[PDB]
Symmetry: D2
């Protein structure tokens, strides 16, 4: 007898199961950039959002909601309570402290391990079967922390790790060479940030090995100084942060990418972080970035890059370093 009723004759009794649901935890700069790129790539049929800052949270949800006319994600929901979160296929954690200008990512660790103690039990409790994508820094360490607190088998705990570093290196390499990044190939592995490993042997355009063409590639004999390029990758979070206070867009895009392979079962290979005890020389429970095949069940295989001898020693030190820190943590 309502207006609505004179107009829509109903015929089917309404229950709901979201069929392709993503959750972003943390709606700060990174969480919101991840949100917008997911919405614009149509990866979900439900997006849920949680954060402890209630007003910001509800303010961001409405901003996004008022743009539904222009999206094809028919449902956007939010809450402090994880129930809004239930049955997500994918949950992205972007919650936590971030670097002040000058600050290392490692100084972040104690603050964000506490945050994780609280979040991860609540996520795995409403979405027992999700894939977890970890973005908060220091990301390898925090990926491990998510792994341990949750109980999940390890194909299902994923860290973004060097996906960003690698995307920045390919951006700088095309810019040097004058070719789109889509066409410059090249892998940054190991730890996100200070001590990632640039794998010079597999850099190429059109299958054309750059280091075979130019044997000094990335040493100190290099007159054309391709170390400065990795160095520029290393130093970019600091340079962006110093300029605009934080980084948001590049990681949002890079995270939407990772979700795409998850939601569409693509099986593309990404430099992401995973639990690699048993491989690359490593015996501790550490997360580092290595090329991983990513699809609807998380990481199911790992490509076995052929590393030089120092390159495997770079990796082993990071494994040593990460574990010394982890030894000390408490769950």
């Amino acid at each position: 007898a309502a207006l609505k009723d004179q107009l829509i004759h109903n015929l089917l009794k309404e229950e709901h199961v979201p069929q392709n649901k993503i959750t972003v935890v943390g709606v700060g700069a990174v969480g919101m950039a991840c949100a917008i790129s997911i919405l614009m790539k149509d990866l979900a049929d439900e997006l849920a959002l949680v954060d402890v800052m209630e007003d910001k949270l509800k303010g961001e949800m409405m901003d996004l909601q008022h743009g539904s006319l222009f999206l094809r994600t028919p449902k956007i929901v939010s809450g402090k309570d994880y129930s809004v979160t239930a049955n997500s296929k994918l949950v992205i954690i972007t919650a936590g402290a971030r670097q002040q200008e000058g600050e290392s990512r490692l100084n972040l660790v104690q603050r964000n391990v506490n945050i994780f103690k609280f979040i991860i039990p609540n996520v795995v409790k409403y979405s027992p079967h999700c894939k977890l994508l970890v973005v908060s820094n220091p990301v390898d360490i925090l990926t491990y922390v998510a792994w341990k607190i949750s109980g999940f088998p390890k194909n299902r705990v994923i860290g973004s790790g060097c996906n960003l570093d690698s995307a920045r290196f390919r951006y700088l390499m095309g810019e040097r060479l004058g070719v789109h990044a889509l066409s410059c190939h090249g892998w940054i592995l190991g730890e996100h940030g200070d001590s990632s490993v640039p794998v010079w042997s597999g850099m190429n355009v059109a299958g054309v090995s750059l280091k075979t063409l130019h044997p000094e590639l990335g040493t100190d004999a290099d007159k054309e100084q391709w170390k400065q390029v990795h160095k520029q990758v290393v130093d970019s979070a600091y340079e962006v942060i110093k300029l605009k206070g934080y980084t948001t867009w590049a990681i949002g895009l890079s995270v939407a990418d990772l979700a795409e392979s998850i939601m569409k079962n693509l099986r593309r290979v990404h430099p992401i972080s995973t639990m690699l005890k048993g491989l690359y020389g490593i015996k501790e429970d550490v997360f580092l970035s290595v090329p991983c095949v990513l699809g609807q069940n998380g990481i199911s295989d790992v490509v076995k890059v052929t590393l030089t001898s120092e390159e495997e020693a770079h990796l082993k030190k990071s494994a040593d370093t990460l574990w010394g820190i982890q030894k000390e943590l408490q769950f």
Copy 2:
């Protein structure tokens, strides 16, 4: 080892159960345009094809698989045997006889009624929970035939109905008004074909009603002959068939559109073909195009349109053509 086994180290016992599968039954002109459109709107993580022509079936599948670098649908499969169809969310039927130049859609009924006797029982054996979308002609009778045989509740059996009629209309309108079809509104309802009803009362640009502006919209004594725009719509199939032999591009797009609403659960309203017994002054169980809310459980609500005496008149006549041709059926 194998090359593969030296390159990729496996971590996760593969075990594939499909998440967003679409199946297309009939790989003729319409089936294949649906396939390329669905593939290009990224709506499936898996596409299955069936047909009775083995060679044809497998050359179409191979041809699709080869453009696969430029797609984001990781698995394309086909088979004469319907087990390649198992667990599809949406099965689309585009199998059977089409019109020769000059020929009525309803003249194809008998040949295709028989084809559906073979086809439908096989679909619902492999995909018992699926939504069926019928494209084959006469699409309204065949929708009813798919529903009786299959035994599915009515929400789950959808005729592409007047979705294409409405979209030709909007196109011819915008052409006359100088404005994109996206911005010209107006509905064709009833039978997909000779007895579709133009709802002149609801045509508009921007909320401004066209028959109010110009009262002889839709009668024969109108100086600028707007009635030949619905003349043009019904004659559409017969003109294009006469020129290129069949129609393909427009149905595929139209079909991928409805496919989009279903897989993403948009809940848009389309003029599609549903069992409207009990609604719209109609007491027999026939299918015909009416505005329908379309989501992941199929059709859930119908919009009640205010039709005149005449508009309301044609429908039950549209509705009885199809009637008289229906309970007279051996299946």
Copy 3:
């Protein structure tokens, strides 16, 4: 024998003129949301950003470039100098004066006037053939200021206007109705903000007027009370500002939809802000929101809606006050 030349043989000397370039002026939350939305829709082959805050603007530029791999817009540039802006088809202004509390809303305007008296001449100098889209508030006055300063003909100076109020209206409408905003229609015309006009007669789903079904619509004694909806719509950004301190996402999505019409030449109707002396019984040089055909040459036609005469008055009385302000400005 540097490395770029060892690998790549150059066959052509590159006098790059960009073909579908877009500029965004101001890189605050709003402008950086038009930017990422434009970038995600593959509308431009080059994106220029300008702003007087140098570091912020450089940091936002690199944050975007860093995500190049994931975008299809090969060149992003930035500077204080509008020469980076050269050759744009479309220029989007989101810049304006920090807000001056307890101060007349005519010092305020006249201050923006002062920003525009620098901005507008520079944009038009480097992009003579471009199209300006004004978003900065107060949008109708400032659109007027840009028309004045630039000297452009009126079809090429567009205010974002009620574009977003109406997306908001259709969101809240669908929500009350249980249907995608894509399928609800409804127009909010006039002055962006407190003084806008919900056109009740044009509100429909599937061509069925809601005013006619339930003819008390939008009334005070409309027990079923849809002025709520319109009030929500005007209260809309105070509430969001109150919660997150600004609004961005929905304006960026909204502006990116206008950009798409203009860039692809669609000729869809949007409720935007155009100079409409001569129409709607407005005799002053005033920008009001009306339904406009928008395409590659700006706004080329206007849809003449039939207003109730109280609707008319709101509009006339709007122009009266806008003009009372514009007339006191020094230019």
Copy 4:
């Protein structure tokens, strides 16, 4: 009194020269597949079709137009007369003689030479400033012919080449490895068809060279017989034509991708067919596939792959044949 003028107030008139136009010459299976793929990737604001069969042509145009509601290319036109082609940025040539009953090769080549002596002058006469993409077979010779009849600079005359060959190879590479083709790289170079060169040295996943991991790769004595894979790629059309009667989909998807790099100015590397006298030791006016930087001005740069003595041998040889057939053509 006209309905159009009671509704729309016109604000400006008819300086209409399209900005991002594309023409497809030839509306057989391939022509139409390039057309649908271009339409669904939104790369043009106008699409024109040409062909000598007038009915088919008209009829395909119309089929497409009825699809407008679901597309965003507001304008589709067609005719036997090349004036509909005026102002194209890209012209795509898919027309040619139907092959015959094993007549000579001169004899196949020259009969398209004769079709091209009509088609090319007409295209350039109306779009003097365009890029030409030739897709017709034999493609490397018919690209030369097109370059020759047209007088264009060689950056602006491009052949399809081994683009689809490489695509098919990566697909098959991917099927063996369990990874999406997007993540498998390898390059088929030289002359299209059986004389093509699979460049074994640069095949890889995540930068790890298959060659170094697997020594006997692309050798006959190869236990795994990866060589049989380049065999499949070169046999692929014979086998697809043998099954379904012709090939369409994969080729049109692959041409739409070249189109995008051209229209969006991406400067990605594709293996396409180019005039390379002066590179790879080539001697005569001849077209061979080579990795090529593709943008808004055609091919501007070329990648120098390090080929084996034997591999240069295959390329230099093709160059000799190409030239032997060419030096006798009649123009």
